[PDB]
From a paper:
In the present study, we elucidated the crystal structure of Mycobacterium tuberculosis H37Rv HigA2 (hereafter referred to as MtHigA2), which contains an HTH motif. The HigA antitoxin represses the transcription of HigBA or forms a stable HigBA complex, thereby preventing the ribonuclease activity of the HigB toxin and the associated cytotoxic events. Structural studies of MtHigA2 confirmed that it has three regions: (i) a disordered N-terminus that is liable to cleavage, (ii) an α-helix bundle containing an HTH motif for DNA binding and (iii) a β-lid for dimerization. The antitoxin MtHigA2 has two binding partners: DNA and the toxin MtHigB2.
The crystal structure of MtHigA2 was determined from three distinct crystal forms. Form I belonged to space group P212121 and was determined to 2.0 Å resolution, form II packed in space group P43212 and was determined to 3.2 Å resolution, and form III was solved in space group P3121 to 3.4 Å resolution. However, the N-terminal ∼25 residues are unstructured in all three observed crystal forms. All dimers share the β-lid as their major dimeric interface, but the position of the α-helix bundle varies. When the different dimers are aligned based on a single HTH motif from one monomer, the corresponding motif in the dimer pair shows a different relative position. The flexibility in dimerization leads to drastic changes in the locations of positively charged residues on the HTH motif, including His54, Arg56 and Arg59. To predict the physiological dimer, each form was submitted to the PISA server to calculate the strength of the dimer interface. Interestingly, all of the forms had similarly favourable dissociation energies (ΔG): −14, −15 and −17 kcal mol−1 for forms I, II and III, respectively. This suggests that the flexibility of the β-lid does not impact the formation of a stable dimer and is likely to contribute to function. The three different crystal structures in our study reveal the flexibility in dimerization mode while anchored by the β-lid.
Numbering used by the authors:
A (entry chain B): 31 to 100
B (entry chain A): 31 to 101
């Protein structure tokens, strides 16, 4: 059900070089986070990389039965 | 929202310095998060704090008429 974000940036036929250039972040950072690991990666870094695809990013927190965004 | 995790942490009356140990992260990192600024956080670092507290960390992406997960 999880769709790691390399196969999501390929939904709209785009290349890392292109996502890294309107995100204004080193292609180093795209390769690492597009690889399959999103931990290392900052939030702002991630947020910028998703804004590139013309999407929005939401961090929702769930504990017991309460939910809200950061 | 802003005043949340603070309330949540204080909700169970836990001390900043406890959490910093429960999730094995710098206490300073906890003032920041609880503080409100979260952009500068690494994702795993943020995840740890939520884990230690007891909840879960969900990262939904909305792309027009869609919604996907990734961790």
């Amino acid at each position: 059900r999880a769709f790691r974000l390399r196969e999501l940036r390929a939904a709209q036929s785009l290349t890392q070089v292109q996502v890294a250039a309107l995100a204004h972040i080193r292609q180093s950072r795209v390769s690492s986070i597009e690889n399959g690991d999103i931990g290392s990666a900052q939030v702002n870094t991630l947020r910028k990389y998703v804004s590139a695809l013309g999407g929005e990013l939401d961090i929702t927190v769930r504990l017991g039965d309460e939910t809200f965004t950061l």
